[PDB]
Design an enzyme around this catalytic site. Structure first.
Site, short mmCIF file in Angstrom:
data_model
loop_
_atom_site.label_atom_id
_atom_site.label_comp_id
_atom_site.label_asym_id
_atom_site.label_seq_id
_atom_site.Cartn_x
_atom_site.Cartn_y
_atom_site.Cartn_z
N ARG A 17 0.94 -0.97 -0.12
CA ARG A 17 -0.04 0.05 -0.07
C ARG A 17 0.98 1.22 -0.02
N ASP A 38 5.52 -7.35 1.58
CA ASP A 38 4.67 -6.65 2.76
C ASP A 38 4.43 -7.39 3.88
OD1 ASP A 38 2.15 -5.09 3.72
OD2 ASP A 38 3.22 -3.85 2.49
N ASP A 64 7.95 -10.41 6.59
CA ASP A 64 8.10 -9.73 8.05
C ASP A 64 9.34 -9.43 8.13
OD1 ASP A 64 8.30 -8.90 10.59
OD2 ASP A 64 7.17 -10.66 11.74
N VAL A 65 9.88 -8.19 7.80
CA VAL A 65 11.32 -7.88 7.70
C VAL A 65 12.01 -7.74 9.14
CG1 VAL A 65 11.00 -6.02 5.68
CG2 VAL A 65 10.97 -5.09 8.06
N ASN A 91 11.67 0.24 1.93
CA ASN A 91 10.38 1.01 2.22
C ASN A 91 9.51 0.66 3.49
OD1 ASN A 91 8.03 3.15 1.27
ND2 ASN A 91 7.05 1.10 1.53
N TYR A 156 11.03 7.24 15.44
CA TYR A 156 10.95 7.63 14.25
C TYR A 156 12.13 8.35 13.91
CZ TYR A 156 9.17 8.63 9.47
OH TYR A 156 9.12 8.91 8.13
N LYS A 160 15.30 7.17 11.43
CA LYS A 160 15.56 7.94 10.42
C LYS A 160 17.02 8.37 10.32
CE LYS A 160 11.82 6.49 8.28
NZ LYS A 160 11.77 5.58 7.38
#
Lengths: 241, 239, 251, 238
Positions: A17, A38, A64-65, A91, A156, A160
């Site tokens: 998505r 995903d 599942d990363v 991503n 977050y 990053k």
């Protein structure tokens, strides 16, 4: 008909998505064969099937990363079935809401760090053999939050800034193998919670999803063949303000 | 790829080197190109080679330090074409001098004058044309705008100034629909050990590898990018 | 003699050895009462006992910064006994050697991220109530590796870039509470060279080939900027990462 | 009485008012002998005389930092009378108001670049012999505007980004001579573009910029060179 990724094999995580689905479609439109993965495999397969129906080459899977065994299994499959990987786009990511002085910040930190940083590490490290074989390249999803605190939660922001650094050190270690590693740093895009961004963005608008896809494709393409270790803001001027 | 189809592009320092290559690259992406250089003969020779290949190009002499001459060119572009779609500020010089040497002053004045003051002159004068077309600007910054590297003080400072010029032009011209960005190359095909020891790709970039990022920034692919300085440096600044 | 930290309570992690021990001593010399903690409680207590013998006020304890229960217990003890904390220095840290394309990079990544990033988060988050009560400040140990890849392993580079971002967002969320949050970003300093058998030949070249001062920093030259940031001289500085690197990042 | 600059000779430009006057006073309070210069020599001498009346060693002069002949004359005088210079603080600076698309931006650009960047170059370059003899150090006045555009006029933003780069390259070329070169980057000093983003939700007091300047000029910063230190209440981290 631009063909920036003609016949290149591209793996996009979080492709079920939002921006990940849009990156997958954009890569396919630039000529790529796309593997969409995903946490929601049904969504990855639905996006892939839509691309197949439009005349592109695509397949979808659940991943599942955060599961190192599952990540390794996918890497082994890609190397076996295709002989290499031309582009990895990390991503998959999540965000959350918590101020640092709140107890909830810990659960949010663990969840966000786990997907955004540890998952990107898992996938990047596992795919090195396939990227070496193809002399492919990696594009991470960074953020304006990798440069300033902005309005995002601590986990977050830290994830990053961590991706910014991961871009640099992966670029260093994989340059001898002909692998470029870069990142995009979007602000908020279409895919007063947003005032922190909207009050500073020079273009006074949220970016269209396609406006983040295009710089990803640029970095993954030979137009960027002398670009590595680099994080490209795609932020309507936010970080320059 | 048609990234600049029928767009009018002005490139300074276009008689040789990167500037001539940016001009050719923009034409190959469909642009009409105005090439200007301190050597007007070289600018016209580059423009004529593009015309021979069926592109639309013209060349002129321009001293970017001459505010009257810059204003005359901006007036000409606005009158003849009604606007300007892309400005590439590529005119630039360098020099050799350590800061503690008396020669540093002459080098400083010369390099600041072309690289910073000339970029201001051209950028400021073309604002009316850029407004009319909602065009965009790409400056030539450098890795020297981020670290001292091995360049002379006037060059380092001129490129750090260009980095800041990119941000504040982007701020002031955003309400008019004008994006402003820069590329930051390393050492270019068009001593150097300080660069080679740190560049991850262990090679000098090809001119085309700097042209392509300039075209990207000048194109709709970069329509949500402004105020941004993009290293094109083989990994130098990440090392 | 400067008394920049007069009567302030300072907690230093990784204080049993090297730079952490030197920060603890430097804080005491500036008038602070110091709590030294280290994974090796015996080392923290040896350093604290030497400060006590010298005439300072100091105490040492074992602390595993990766153990959230242990970290919470220390934070509760500080709040109960002292009512707040004036300075937190997150110095505990480790490195490693592994290139990204080697399998060994995973174990090194997990260990280095675990101490450097997750441990700094554990200690910082747990001490927020004590820092609020005192309107204290935090100094993190970043690195030049938080700005460029340099010569460090991936887990170290990423942990230090993460610390750079942690500095910013902690500063953001704790500024309304009068808490400043900053970091130093050292190059190599002498304490990191103190164990000869672990100094691989050429292992400092990544730094020495670029540093403008052409020397490793003295440990005291990293201690002084930490004390500065922890002091009222830095009362309008927050969210900031200060290189202490001989010019390395400017080169 | 920390004595961070004990017996050091400190030259401050723009020292007749505002931050420059406060840096001069703060340097004297840290033990320095201070030379105060300002475009307005009357104000520089007034500040210097007030320090003298407190028992400090201070002197004031007029200096137009844009006049290379006058800068050279001061450098020659310092070398002749003192033989070296321990600290140079380049604080002389101006601002202005003009948007980039206005014609007025050209005159504002020329004025601001001329003082802030070209003046800092003039004074820095001319005093290299004196800084070498003392193994002194330089502190430039940068700004948050050297990192982001903020709300300042183009010439000011560019002048401060130029100073950020000047800090790095001066540090590089002068390190072999034992000279450190750094800068402070204040925000707005004693406006919504700044106030709405600063984490401390206040403008810094002048003393809060003086203290970081003194730190960078002192042996506490002896392993710090080429560095630009924000003194900005968290603005650049937001």
């Amino acid at each position: 008909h631009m063909e920036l990724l003609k016949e290149k094999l591209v793996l996009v995580t979080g492709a079920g998505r939002g921006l990940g689905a849009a990156i997958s479609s954009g890569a396919a439109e630039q000529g790529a064969r796309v593997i969409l993965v995903d946490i929601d495999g049904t969504a990855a397969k639905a996006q892939a099937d839509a691309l197949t129906a439009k005349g592109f080459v695509a397949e979808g899977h659940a991943l599942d990363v955060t599961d190192r065994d599952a990540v390794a299994a996918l890497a082994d499959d890609i190397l076996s079935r295709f002989g290499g990987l031309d582009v990895l786009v990390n991503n998959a990511g999540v965000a959350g809401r918590a101020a640092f002085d709140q107890p909830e910040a810990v659960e949010v930190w663990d969840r966000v760090i786990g997907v955004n940083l540890e998952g990107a590490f898992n996938v990047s490290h596992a795919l090195v053999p396939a990227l070496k074989a193809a002399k492919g390249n990696v594009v991470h999803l960074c953020s304006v939050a990798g440069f300033v605190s902005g309005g995002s939660t601590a986990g977050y922001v830290v994830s990053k800034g961590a991706i910014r650094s991961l871009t640099q050190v992966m670029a260093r270690d994989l340059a001898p193998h002909g692998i470029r590693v870069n990142a995009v740093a979007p602000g908020i895009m279409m895919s007063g919670g947003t005032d922190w961004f909207m009050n500073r963005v020079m273009m006074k608008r949220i970016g269209e999803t396609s406006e983040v896809v295009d710089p990803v494709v640029f970095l993954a393409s030979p137009m960027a063949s002398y670009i590595t270790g680099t994080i490209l803001p795609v932020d309507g001027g936010f970080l320059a303000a």
